């Protein structure tokens, strides 16, 4: 499966759990996806940095879910992956 095949409601949960866990999460992921730690430091000054990383990676061929889940392991942040595997079931009528 590709990250571009996911529904809009799933991508919203990933953004919410990134931004609600930390502000450097996407930077670590970028570093292990092929970017550089000091190079992302200029990217953090953008208006849509989290969305720009996901967009610039989704335009590549490595944008697969199996690779994304394993890319959190590189940085050592299984906390993002485990939070999402436990936070798959949350909705209300309100």
């Amino acid at each position: 499966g590709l990250y571009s095949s996911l529904p809009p409601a799933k991508r919203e949960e990933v953004e919410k759990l990134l931004n609600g866990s930390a502000g450097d999460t996407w930077r670590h992921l970028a570093g292990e996806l092929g970017y550089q730690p000091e190079h992302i430091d200029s990217f953090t000054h953008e208006a849509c940095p989290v969305r720009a990383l996901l967009a610039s990676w989704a335009t590549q061929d490595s944008a697969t879910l199996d690779a994304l889940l394993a890319a959190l392991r590189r940085i050592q942040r299984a906390d993002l992956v485990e939070s999402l595997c436990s936070e798959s079931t949350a909705t209300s009528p309100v």
Binding site: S21, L69, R74, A78
Partner: protein, 105 residues
Amino acid sequence: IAQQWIQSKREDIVNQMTEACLNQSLDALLSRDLIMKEDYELVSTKPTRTSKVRQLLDTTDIQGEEFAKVIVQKLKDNKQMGLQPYPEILVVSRSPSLNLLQNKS
């Protein structure tokens, strides 16, 4: 698992990691691109041995399992017997975290 463990034995890791252990964990942290030079200098300025480990724990707030496991995995090489019950290390293969299931209609 390691995110919970770093909040169980937080008072043991600082007492077990003398100072040379912190320098080795720091080199290993930068190898994973999880810490920028902009904040990796703030952990290396601390003039007090125990205060070095304080700034290292302040990054764990944003990191969760990353700056946590680096401690557990450094102390393993030094086998100090203070923390033998270490947490997990990267047990996910393809869990229902990011994976799709929904479709049009």
